[PDB]
Amino acid sequence: RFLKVKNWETEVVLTDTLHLKSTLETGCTEYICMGSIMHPATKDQLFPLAKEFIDQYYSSIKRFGSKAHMERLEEVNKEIDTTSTYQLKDTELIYGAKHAWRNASRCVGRIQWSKLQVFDARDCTTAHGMFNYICNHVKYATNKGNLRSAITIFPQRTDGKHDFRVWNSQLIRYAGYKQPDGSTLGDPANVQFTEICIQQGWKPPRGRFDVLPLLLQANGNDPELFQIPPELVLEVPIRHPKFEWFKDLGLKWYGLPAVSNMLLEIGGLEFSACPFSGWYMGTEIGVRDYCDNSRYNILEEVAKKMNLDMRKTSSLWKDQALVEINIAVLYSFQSDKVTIVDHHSATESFIKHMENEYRCRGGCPADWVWIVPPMSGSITPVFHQEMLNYRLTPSFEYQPDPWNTHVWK
Amino acid sequence: CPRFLKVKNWETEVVLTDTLHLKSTLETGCTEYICMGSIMHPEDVATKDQLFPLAKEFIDQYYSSIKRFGSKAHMERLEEVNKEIDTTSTYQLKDTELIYGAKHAWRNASRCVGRIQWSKLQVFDARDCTTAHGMFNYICNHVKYATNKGNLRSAITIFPQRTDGKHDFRVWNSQLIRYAGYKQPDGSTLGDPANVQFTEICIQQGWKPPRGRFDVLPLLLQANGNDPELFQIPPELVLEVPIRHPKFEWFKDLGLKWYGLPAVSNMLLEIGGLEFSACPFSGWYMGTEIGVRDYCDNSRYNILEEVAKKMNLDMRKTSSLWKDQALVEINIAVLYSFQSDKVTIVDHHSATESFIKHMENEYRCRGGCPADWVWIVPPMSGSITPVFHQEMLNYRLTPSFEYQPDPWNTHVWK
Numbered sequence: 079r080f081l082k083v084k085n086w087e088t089e090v091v092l093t094d095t096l097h098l099k100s101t102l103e104t105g106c107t108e109y110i111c112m113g114s115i116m117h118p119a120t121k122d123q124l125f126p127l128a129k130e131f132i133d134q135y136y137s138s139i140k141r142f143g144s145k146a147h148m149e150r151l152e153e154v155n156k157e158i159d160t161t162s163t164y165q166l167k168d169t170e171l172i173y174g175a176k177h178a179w180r181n182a183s184r185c186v187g188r189i190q191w192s193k194l195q196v197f198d199a200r201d202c203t204t205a206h207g208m209f210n211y212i213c214n215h216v217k218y219a220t221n222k223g224n225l226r227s228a229i230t231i232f233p234q235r236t237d238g239k240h241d242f243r244v245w246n247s248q249l250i251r252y253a254g255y256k257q258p259d260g261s262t263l264g265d266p267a268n269v270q271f272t273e274i275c276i277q278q279g280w281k282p283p284r285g286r287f288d289v290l291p292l293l294l295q296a297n298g299n300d301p302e303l304f305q306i307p308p309e310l311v312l313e314v315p316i317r318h319p320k321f322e323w324f325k326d327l328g329l330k331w332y333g334l335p336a337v338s339n340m341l342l343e344i345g346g347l348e349f350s351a352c353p354f355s356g357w358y359m360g361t362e363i364g365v366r367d368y369c370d371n372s373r374y375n376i377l378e379e380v381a382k383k384m385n386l387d388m389r390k391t392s393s394l395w396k397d398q399a400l401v402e403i404n405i406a407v408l409y410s411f412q413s414d415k416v417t418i419v420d421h422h423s424a425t426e427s428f429i430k431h432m433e434n435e436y437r438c439r440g441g442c443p444a445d446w447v448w449i450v451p452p453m454s455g456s457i458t459p460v461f462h463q464e465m466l467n468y469r470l471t472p473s474f475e476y477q478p479d480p481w482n483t484h485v486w487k
Numbered sequence: 488c489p490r491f492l493k494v495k496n497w498e499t500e501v502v503l504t505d506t507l508h509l510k511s512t513l514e515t516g517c518t519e520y521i522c523m524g525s526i527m528h529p530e531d532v533a534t535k536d537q538l539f540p541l542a543k544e545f546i547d548q549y550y551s552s553i554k555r556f557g558s559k560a561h562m563e564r565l566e567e568v569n570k571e572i573d574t575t576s577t578y579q580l581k582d583t584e585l586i587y588g589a590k591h592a593w594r595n596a597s598r599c600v601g602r603i604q605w606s607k608l609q610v611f612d613a614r615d616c617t618t619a620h621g622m623f624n625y626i627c628n629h630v631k632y633a634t635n636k637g638n639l640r641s642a643i644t645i646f647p648q649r650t651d652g653k654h655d656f657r658v659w660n661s662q663l664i665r666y667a668g669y670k671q672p673d674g675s676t677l678g679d680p681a682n683v684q685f686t687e688i689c690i691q692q693g694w695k696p697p698r699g700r701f702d703v704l705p706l707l708l709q710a711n712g713n714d715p716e717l718f719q720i721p722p723e724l725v726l727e728v729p730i731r732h733p734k735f736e737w738f739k740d741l742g743l744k745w746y747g748l749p750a751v752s753n754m755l756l757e758i759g760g761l762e763f764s765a766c767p768f769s770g771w772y773m774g775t776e777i778g779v780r781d782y783c784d785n786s787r788y789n790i791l792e793e794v795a796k797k798m799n800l801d802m803r804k805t806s807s808l809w810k811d812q813a814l815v816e817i818n819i820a821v822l823y824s825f826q827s828d829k830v831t832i833v834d835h836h837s838a839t840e841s842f843i844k845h846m847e848n849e850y851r852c853r854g855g856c857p858a859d860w861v862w863i864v865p866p867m868s869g870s871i872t873p874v875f876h877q878e879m880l881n882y883r884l885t886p887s888f889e890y891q892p893d894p895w896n897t898h899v900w901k
């Protein structure tokens with residue numbers, strides 16, 4: 079049955095028919111909602127999954143039931159029969175990748191989904207080759223600050239014993255170190271991965287913003303360390319348009335957000351290595367990266383320099399320091415002409431994007447809990463926007479951290 | 488379902504195990520293939536057969552709570568209720584049961600961040616009420632008691648339950664205390680835009696509006712299914728706070744003020760299958776309720792722009808975050824004004840911190856705590872409050888507070 083979503087600010091009402099095409103589960107039941115939970119093949123299973131994907135591909139290019147469509151199905155069935163798997167055509171690969179992004183309920187940036195540069199790395203066989211592909215990705219995506227969305231797709235999972243994995247959670251991240259006393263130098267989110275690198279032979283500068291090495295795993299072998307050429311890593315020193323002391327905090331960040339630990343699923347096939355990149359919404363750095371307790375935690379230091387009253391919470395000193403930090407981040411990127419979007423602008427685009435999708439697609443899966451920005455929620459248009467969440471394929475999925483699964487040789 | 492459900496806090500890595508969801512009663516609106524957790528809203532009267540098991544379930548729960556489950560008293564109460572349903576098709580709650588039910592409707596309110604206080608709730612029994620004048624009397628006493636000269640005390644007043652659905656008691660007001668909103672011919676709105684509809688209804692019922700920015704609405708009260716009647720709440724019973732700012736001298740020049748007592752009156756209380764259509768209840772405010780939503784919402788007082796102008800922020804780029812900056816100062820002002828005037832209020836950092844402690848305790852001692860993340864997380868600065876990183880489970884336990892249609896949509900005029 080059709081479902082309605084209402085915007086309470088504008089009273090605009092959209093009708094969802096798209097959810098009727100979903101097949102994967104949300105995590106919820108009729109009795110319990112799990113909307114705030116972060117994480118709620120064989121020949122036999124594979125072909126219908128493949129058949130489904132091939133179907134909507136040919137439906138997308140308006141050639142459903144064509145001879146070419148029929149033949150492709152017959153070709154895929156025979157190939158699963160003989161080899162227990164199948165390979166995607168280049169067109170299918172690109173379509174599948176764009177629609178995995180399109181279907182990403184938690185991404186507020188999806189108005190861009192069809193502008194995605196797809197790099198086909200399924201011929202890769204070694205970690206050295208993975209390194210090369212990734213360098214090319216980073217260079218292309220960065221584009222001297224005029225960032226471009228991209229995804230590099232490495233060979234699909236075979237028997238599960240020969241997975242390609244990027245062990246980094248992002249291509250570019252700063253190191254974190256457990257200090258002797260107990261605190262943390264650098265980025266606390268990355269303390270474990272940093273130690274994994276150090277064990278593998280990485281010589282840490284033990285600085286505050288050390289770019290981590292790539293830890294790359296090809297065909298199920300032991301992962302190998304590589305250093306991204308520094309000239310490929312674009313960074314932005316964070317300063318504030320009024321507070322001239324803000325630069326004295328010695329903060330900077332990287333311009334390219336590039337998530338590398340997720341799994342891309344297309345027509346039953348699993349791509350365990352598929353780093354993808356876009357550009358930042360300011361809050362991702364300014365709110366989460368800098369102000370989470372389990373992160374850089376600079377709220378105190380900034381509020382002190384703003385000489386704010388920090389004894390009582392009701393002075394909202396945390397709230398004030400937060401806005402200023404996020405002003406600094408936006409101002410810094412824009413001044414260095416590195417692509418960035420503020421949460422007001424991003425959330426506006428998303429409402430516009432939703433309207434588009436309801437119009438041409440009959441819906442848009444959207445995770446309110448993740449779509450609403452981590453600051454100033456209700457003065458953004460998405461706060462008052464009702465959303466329906468459901469799981470469409472092709473999709474990006476979570477997967478276990480490889481150091482929990484890998485058997486070292 | 489399985490017997491155990493785990494939730495994680497991603498900031499502290501604390502994990503909690505929920506068994507209480509097994510007692511869940513109604514549908515959530517979600518299914519296996521769709522989540523509706525951001526949907527605001529995902530005659531009637533129960534029959535003898537429908538009522539029997541619902542009352543039994545509640546009476547069982549009550550006697551379980553006072554450690555007398557299976558006792559002679561438990562069994563006699565069950566038999567008494569059963570016979571009363573059999574021969575009257577309804578039943579009456581004992582005072583103890585009524586008080587227990589009301590407290591637990593609040594305890595079970597998944598959208599409420601303030602539930603650490605749930606056991607401290609003054610329950611006013613108004614089931615002897617027969618007329619709108621009497622409703623007015625009970626409601627005045629509620630306001631005076633709850634307000635306590637600024638030392639607010641949470642309270643609920645419960646009017647007679649529903650019978651045949653044609654004799655409902657209703658408070659037509661959405662809250663006991665709200666400001667009027669007036670639509671102007673030129674398209675603009677004076678006062679509170681959120682209340683324009685109810686204001687017009689009052690004006691049609693006979694109310695003479697002062698037509699100001701902060702006119703307290705009259706009470707519109709329906710007893711026993713009769714046409715509603717208008718009453719003016721004694722002005723001295725309405726505690727208000729002028730909003731000023733601890734640094735900005737000019738903030739007072741905005742002429743803003745708000746009322747101290749948040750008292751919601753359009754919800755339905757459901758206990759053991761009985762339905763109390765008029766059950767006004769009140770607590771004290773979280774600042775953002777007034778400072779973010781009431782003031783800064785576009786379809787509300789919308790002073791963000793004017794505050795920004797007096798702060799001389801660049802308002803041409805959104806990326807200057809002039810809105811964000813203004814919003815903070817506004818909420819600073821609200822909190823400062825209330826505290827200075829010794830009127831009870833809580834900032835979002837305190838409330839969310841208290842709620843986390845509450846939730847943990849509930850998981851520990853009750854086996855869970857239904858919570859709606861979408862409502863629990865505050866409308867500003869979400870990620871720097873401890874609830875943002877806390878996974879939650881939402882499900883519906885009874886007794887409960889429910890939504891119900893606005894009474895003008897269904898009322899048969901005499």
Ligand code: HEM
Pocket residue numbers: 179182184185186187188190194227228229354355356357358359362419424448474
């Ligand atoms: C082009 C600019 C983009 C912007 C501004 C943007 C913005 C965002 C933001 C703010 C989040 C929440 C991140 C967090 O809080 O951790 C997010 C999540 C996500 N994005 Fe986008 N994004 C962009 C491009 C992309 C691209 C190119 C892809 C894939 C091809 C993508 C796929 C995803 C996925 C899969 C998630 C959430 C993963 C999960 O937790 O399930 N995004 N995005």
Ligand code: HEM
Pocket residue numbers: 589592593596598599600601602604608641642643768769770771772773776833838862888
């Ligand atoms: C004691 C101080 C209290 C505080 C600080 C508090 C705080 C809040 C807040 C901030 C909300 C969200 C409101 C909104 O965003 O519009 C809320 C909702 C709610 N509260 Fe509380 N509350 C308190 C007392 C109470 C009491 C005494 C009751 C009932 C006995 C109650 C029942 C509810 C219910 C049923 C909702 C959500 C209603 C819905 O589903 O829309 N609360 N509370």
Ligand SMILES: Cc1cc(N)nc2cc(-c3ccc(CN)cc3)ccc12
Pocket residue numbers: 335336337354355356357358359362
């Ligand atoms: C492609 C892209 C762009 C962007 N601005 N942010 C992302 C953020 C994520 C992301 C990052 C981290 C997590 C879990 N901490 C969940 C999602 C993934 C991709 C992103």
Ligand SMILES: Cc1cc(N)nc2cc(-c3ccc(CN)cc3)ccc12
Pocket residue numbers: 749750751768769770771772773776
């Ligand atoms: C008892 C109590 C205290 C408080 N501070 N806020 C409430 C807020 C509500 C509430 C207010 C508004 C809405 C829908 N706009 C839904 C629930 C209900 C009760 C409250």
Ligand SMILES: C[C@H](O)[C@H](O)[C@H]1CNc2nc(N)[nH]c(=O)c2N1
Pocket residue numbers: 086461462463464465524525526527861862863864
């Ligand atoms: C669309 C969305 O569900 C709606 O605007 C909700 C979101 N969360 C909320 N949370 C609270 N506390 N109060 C609200 O009014 C809302 N509004």
Ligand SMILES: C[C@H](O)[C@H](O)[C@H]1CNc2nc(N)[nH]c(=O)c2N1
Pocket residue numbers: 113114115116447448449497875876877878879
């Ligand atoms: C518990 C909760 O689901 C978790 O902290 C989520 C909430 N919403 C989020 N939203 C975004 N965009 N990013 C996040 O990491 C989170 N964290």
Ligand SMILES: [Zn+2]
Pocket residue numbers: 106110111112113517518521522523524
């Ligand atoms: Zn759900």
